[PDB]
Design an enzyme around this catalytic site. Sequence first.
Site, PDB file in Angstrom:
ATOM      1  N   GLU A 154       0.811  -1.212   0.000  1.00  0.00           N
ATOM      2  CA  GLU A 154       0.000   0.000   0.000  1.00  0.00           C
ATOM      3  C   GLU A 154       0.847   1.266   0.000  1.00  0.00           C
ATOM      4  O   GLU A 154       0.408   2.315   0.488  1.00  0.00           O
ATOM      5  CB  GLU A 154      -1.003  -0.016   1.171  1.00  0.00           C
ATOM      6  CG  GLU A 154      -2.210  -0.897   0.884  1.00  0.00           C
ATOM      7  CD  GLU A 154      -2.956  -1.384   2.119  1.00  0.00           C
ATOM      8  OE1 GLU A 154      -2.676  -0.943   3.258  1.00  0.00           O
ATOM      9  OE2 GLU A 154      -3.857  -2.235   1.940  1.00  0.00           O
ATOM     10  N   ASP A 202      -0.776  -5.702   9.015  1.00  0.00           N
ATOM     11  CA  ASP A 202      -1.817  -4.994   9.733  1.00  0.00           C
ATOM     12  C   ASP A 202      -1.886  -5.467  11.174  1.00  0.00           C
ATOM     13  O   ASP A 202      -1.765  -6.669  11.462  1.00  0.00           O
ATOM     14  CB  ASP A 202      -3.156  -5.163   9.030  1.00  0.00           C
ATOM     15  CG  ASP A 202      -3.310  -4.205   7.879  1.00  0.00           C
ATOM     16  OD1 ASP A 202      -2.771  -4.439   6.797  1.00  0.00           O
ATOM     17  OD2 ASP A 202      -3.952  -3.165   8.065  1.00  0.00           O
ATOM     18  N   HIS A 241      -0.403  -0.332  10.632  1.00  0.00           N
ATOM     19  CA  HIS A 241       0.695  -1.239  10.298  1.00  0.00           C
ATOM     20  C   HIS A 241       1.866  -1.309  11.310  1.00  0.00           C
ATOM     21  O   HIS A 241       2.123  -0.367  12.067  1.00  0.00           O
ATOM     22  CB  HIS A 241       1.270  -0.906   8.914  1.00  0.00           C
ATOM     23  CG  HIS A 241       0.301  -1.077   7.789  1.00  0.00           C
ATOM     24  ND1 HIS A 241       0.227  -0.192   6.732  1.00  0.00           N
ATOM     25  CD2 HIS A 241      -0.623  -2.037   7.542  1.00  0.00           C
ATOM     26  CE1 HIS A 241      -0.695  -0.602   5.882  1.00  0.00           C
ATOM     27  NE2 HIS A 241      -1.225  -1.719   6.347  1.00  0.00           N
TER      28      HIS A 241
HETATM   29 MN   LIG Z   1      -3.069  -2.664   5.545  1.00  0.00          MN
END
Ligand SMILES: [Mn+2]
Length: 587
Positions: free
Chosen positions: A334, A358, A524
């Site tokens: 990301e 995550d 994160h």
């Molecule tokens: Mn994520």
Amino acid sequence: IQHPRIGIRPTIDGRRQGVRESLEVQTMNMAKSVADLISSTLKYPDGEPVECVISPSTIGRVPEAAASHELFKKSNVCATITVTPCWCYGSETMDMSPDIPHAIWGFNGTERPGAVYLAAVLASHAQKGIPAFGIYGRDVQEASDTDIPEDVKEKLLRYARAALATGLMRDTAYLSMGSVSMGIGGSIVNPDFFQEYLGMRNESVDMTEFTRRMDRGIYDPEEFERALKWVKENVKEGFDHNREDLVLSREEKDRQWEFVIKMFMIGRDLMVGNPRLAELGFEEEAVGHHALVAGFQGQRQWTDHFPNGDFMETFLNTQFDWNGIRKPFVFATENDSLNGVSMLFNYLLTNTPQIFADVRTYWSPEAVKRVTGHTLEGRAAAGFLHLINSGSCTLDGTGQATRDGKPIMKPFWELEESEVQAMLENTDFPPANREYFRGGGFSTRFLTKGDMPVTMVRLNLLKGVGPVLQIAEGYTLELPEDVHHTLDNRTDPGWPTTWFAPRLTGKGAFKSVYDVMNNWGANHGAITYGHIGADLITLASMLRIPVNMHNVPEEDIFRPKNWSLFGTEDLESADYRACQLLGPLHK
Ligand SMILES: [Mn+2]
């Protein structure tokens, strides 16, 4: 991969007619033993031993200091260590370089007053605003002893590991592929942070570049065929969770396998260049973007259309592919540039691959009991966190590599063939969930082994202050099987899972597992094998990044000696005051 050097500076009493002459061999020996300790213990990310440079002579007066400086200027020195067994003339002998760390080791001897020099020279460092570390051994050594005591070794290596990390980052780039991902703050890349704190450049490429390179054959067609064959033999496609009308055909899945392989290749080529591309007539694309670290935005625009980044991300972060065992390419899902840098810190301190995750759920003992009937015990007894990335993770993150029958993550040159095989055997690649990832692809699925010591790490940007670092040392967990399956099936069973319990200390944000989660500064974390908190604290102080949160025992905190002048009681506040006043290295 740069080879930054450590410069060793042997300083000496300048007065002759016997004094200097009689200290020469002992002083030069301290230098040589530090060089040996470092070159025989530490390695660069590429597996080569770390290199040191000793001044052209002992340093008793300023022209010897200038000569040392001259040699260092051209020997790619990222940090210094001054060593002495005697009194020397402080400001005449000190290193004045403001943009690199410095450490002084003063021999603890009685005929050998290195400690008087140590304190005097550090006083000059603090007075002149040039941070330096102080290395003083607990026990008086005999004038003749040449063993480096263990407390001294520990400080030297900690200092060296952190220094080398600053040296490896300097003058490299972070590459963004895409930009901001789903308004995630860390994907709004701040070049001031990279430039000022890390000595790093920022590069950038719109994801269209992938399409261009695929449409026009800008990748190595020979490699592709070897990759396709390797993937078929080694990569096991996983269970398709897609609802009936979203399930792809066997044909379309096979095409997507070819696509994600080319993605990986292009991603890697973008980061570090590729000689083969110059041979194929794409001389410009052959150079790459000089990226020590990078990220792929993915969501929403690209993943809405094309196969997702999971395969590419997993394999860049993994220490092998069809081309053999290798270093990882540190890579952020990301385009979370701050997680990328958090992983980079961990990577450069350890030479081990890094888990991107995550911080998905906090599971209290109470919630586990209601949901599963099971009462948590052992390391899991206080609750734990579900660490699970949205599709990708280093395969080394399986914890399948082993030392002394304990799970670990290893530098690539220590990986055995059976360990690599075990990583693949214990991994699955489920088709992407097409309600989230319309374009398709394949995620990565495994379960990290329990009882692995790890450190979870995160950098956050605080407006008007800059980066601040948080650190949580802990352990991976093995839950009872039925418990794992319940918690997993209820979360995201197509993705890779690590169960993590932070060590609690009863202080600060570590009074409970909940407080650790409640104080975590982003969605994160970066997770490395090992308890590396003390190393991170040391690195952080070198970069003038305050530490907002850590569970490291106070006696392991090792910072430049002038931090002490900002306070000995409120270490946290002293750290903010020091970082605030000194500012980033390259502002
Ligand atoms: Mn994520």
